[PDB]
Structures are given as structure tokens and as C-alpha cells.
Amino acid sequence: IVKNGEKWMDRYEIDSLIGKGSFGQVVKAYDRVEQEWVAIKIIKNKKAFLNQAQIEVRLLELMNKHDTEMKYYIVHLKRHFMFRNHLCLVFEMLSYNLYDLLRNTNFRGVSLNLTRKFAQQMCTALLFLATPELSIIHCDLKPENILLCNPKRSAIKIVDFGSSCQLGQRIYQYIQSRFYRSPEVLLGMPYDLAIDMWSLGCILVEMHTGEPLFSGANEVDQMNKIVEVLGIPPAHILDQAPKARKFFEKLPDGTWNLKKTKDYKPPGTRKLHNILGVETGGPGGRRAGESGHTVADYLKFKDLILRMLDYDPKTRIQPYYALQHSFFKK
Numbered sequence: 154i155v156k157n158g159e160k161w162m163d164r165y166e167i168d169s170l171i172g173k174g175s176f177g178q179v180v181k182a183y184d185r186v187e188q189e190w191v192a193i194k195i196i197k198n199k200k201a202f203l204n205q206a207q208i209e210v211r212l213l214e215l216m217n218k219h220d221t222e223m224k225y226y227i228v229h230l231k232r233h234f235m236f237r238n239h240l241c242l243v244f245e246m247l248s249y250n251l252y253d254l255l256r257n258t259n260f261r262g263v264s265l266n267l268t269r270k271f272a273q274q275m276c277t278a279l280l281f282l283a284t285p286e287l288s289i290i291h292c293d294l295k296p297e298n299i300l301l302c303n304p305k306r307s308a309i310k311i312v313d314f315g316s317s318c319q320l321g322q323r324i325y326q327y328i329q330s331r332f333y334r335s336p337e338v339l340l341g342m343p344y345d346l347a348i349d350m351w352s353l354g355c356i357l358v359e360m361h362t363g364e365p366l367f368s369g370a371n372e373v374d375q376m377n378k379i380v381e382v383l384g385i386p387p388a389h390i391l392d393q394a395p396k397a398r399k400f401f402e403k404l405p406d407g408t409w410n411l412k413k414t415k416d417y418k419p420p421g422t423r424k425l426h427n428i429l430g431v432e433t434g435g436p437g438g439r440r441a442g443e444s445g446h447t448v449a450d451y452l453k454f455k456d457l458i459l460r461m462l463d464y465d466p467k468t469r470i471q472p473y474y475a476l477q478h479s480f481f482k483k
């Protein structure tokens with residue numbers, strides 16, 4: 154749509170394409186007023202993309218009018234305007250995403266110490282979105298949506314509030330990227346902020362092993378891969394779940410098992426203990442003898458992840474309590 158050297162509103166000089174999406178495109182631009190580079194998210198001129206981006210602008214503006222040390226893990230929206238019938242969101246410039254970070258390790262993962270630093274910023278971000286007056290569900294947490302502030306540094310910010318909604322402003326049943334999709338969403342149940350904590354648990358394991366924890370090819374495969382690690386979801390959850398029978402079957406004695414198709418490891422036998430290599434020098438034993446990667450370090454990480462991957466969104470660890478976990482104690 155947009156040429157390099159193009160000048161908008163005697164303010165912005167467009168340089169280059171940063172990214173393309175369902176929603177439109179993101180470009181690098183020079184702001185002559187502030188005298189800084191910015192990222193401009195240009196929404197497509199179609200009602201559907203416009204209406205959803207208006208919700209994104211509303212939630213970012215809501216976050217901005219809250220001044221607390223907790224808010225500075227979210228990309229800053231500087232302002233927005235309409236141009237040639239496109240909603241345009243101006244953000245601060247950030248660096249490359251955590252998926253690019255994994256790609257750069259040849260998908261062998263970053264250290265437990267860098268994983269910790271990412272976890273602690275992300276838990277702080279989730280604590281900020283849980284502030285009662287905000288109550289924002291991100292709904293699309295994944296490595297691609299977490300950007301470094303600076304290519305030299307390990308500071309991060311969350312981007313893409315394109316799917317985000319406040320608690321009790323739910324639009325879509327089908328949300329989150331499949332690998333990072335919570336059991337409650339797979340099961341068609343009303344969702345709350347706990348779905349972001351599920352995504353986070355998936356993301357932290359992937360950041361350390363280099364590979365997605367649950368890489369389903371579709372929803373049925375997704376649930377099967379979760380069940381391989383965590384077992385059959387509790388009956389009290391399956392009993393209240395509209396889509397339980399997409400994946401499971403109830404029995405005379407009030408018990409649930411998998412529906413099987415044509416030929417997974419038996420439920421709960423692919424142990425997070427072995428995926429992390431807690432007692433076998435980390436993922437593929439590639440951390441054998443490295444400092445900050447002792448069995449004790451690994452066990453604390455395992456405990457925190459299993460609390461983030463509670464099937465029950467009610468008892469799943471919440472951001473404040475995740476920040477108090479031993480994994481973050483020096």
C-alpha cells in the first residue's frame with residue numbers, strides 16, 4: 154500500500170515494512186515532532202479489522218492512564234489517527250521477538266537464567282493486566298508477541314492486543330494460537346485471565362528447550378498432547394465443558410477417558426521432569442555441568458510450570474503468587 158520516502162501529515166517519514174498480519178501492516182517511520190523512530194501499525198480499511206483495532210486502542214489507552222512500576226512490560230501506544238481510511242497506531246520502536254530469539258539458537262533454547270528473567274517480566278505484566286479496573290485478557294500470548302526492548306539487552310514487552318478483551322467483554326469462543334491454547338478454551342468454556350498464565354507456562358518451557366511444549370496439528374491433536382503430559386482433566390471440569398465430548402467420553406461410574414482414533418503415550422506418562430531433563434543435564438542433556446542449571450534449579454522451574462499448567466483455571470497460579478515462587482529467590 155505504502156512507498157519508502159512517503160511523508161504523512163508533515164510529521165511521519167515511512168522507511169520500511171516491519172511486519173504483515175491479518176490486521177494490516179507495521180512500518181518503521183521517523184517522527185519529526187518527537188525526533189525519534191516509531192513503529193506504525195496500519196489497519197486495513199475494512200469494517201472487521203477497523204472495529205477490532207478500535208478495541209485494541211481503547212485497551213492500550215486504558216492501560217496508559219494507570220501509573221505503576223507494573224505497567225512498563227507493555228508496548229507504549231504513543232497515539233493513533235485516521236489516514237486514507239486506515240486506523241494507524243503509533244508505538245515506540247522495539248527489537249526482535251522471542252521466536253526470532255529461539256530461531257537464532259537453532260531451536261536449542263536459552264539458559265534457565267535468561268528463561269527466569271523473561272518469566273519474571275511476563276509475570277509482572279500479567280499482574281498489571283489483572284488490576285481490577287483493567288482486568289485485560291491478552292488472549293494471544295506466544296513468543297512472536299514478546300519483543301526485546303533492545304537487541305543488546307534482556308528487557309521485554311508484550312505487543313499485539315488485537316485479540317485482547319476485558320473480563321466479561323468476551324467476543325470469540327475460538328481464541329489463542331493453538332500451541333498456547335488453554336484447556337478451558339479447547340473445551341469451549343467461558344475464559345478469564347488464567348488463560349494467559351497457561352500460555353506463559355507453555356512459552357517458558359519452549360524458551361528453555363527450543364521446541365513448543367504442545368504442538369498440536371489441530372484441536373484434537375492439541376488436547377491429546379496436553380493429556381500425554383498432564384493426564385485426563387478432572388471430571389468436575391469435563392462435566393461443565395460444552396466441548397468435552399470433542400476429545401473425551403464419560404463412563405457409567407462418572408469417569409472420563411480419551412476418545413481414541415486410529416493410531417500417543419498413555420495419559421500423564423510424558424513427564425515434564427524428562428522434557429526439562431531435571432536429572433539428566435537439561436533439555437537433550439545440552440546443559441550438563443553449566444552453572445545455574447543444577448537439579449535444585451530445575452526442580453523449582455518444574456514446580457512453577459506445573460502450577461501455571463493446572464487444568465483448573467480457579468487454582469492455576471496467579472501472577473502475584475508466581476512472583477513469590479522460589480524459582481525467583483536469589
Ligand SMILES: c1cc(-c2ccc3occc3c2)cc(N2CCNCC2)n1
Nearest residue numbers: 171174192194244245246247248312313
Ligand atoms: C502491535 C505492535 C507491534 C509492534 C510494536 C513495536 C515494534 O517495534 C518493532 C516491531 C514492532 C511491532 C506489533 C504488533 N503485532 C500485531 C500482529 N501480530 C504481530 C505483532 N501489534
Ligand SMILES: [Cl-]
Nearest residue numbers: 252296332365
Ligand atoms: Cl512457535
Ligand SMILES: [Cl-]
Nearest residue numbers: 293316328329
Ligand atoms: Cl486469538
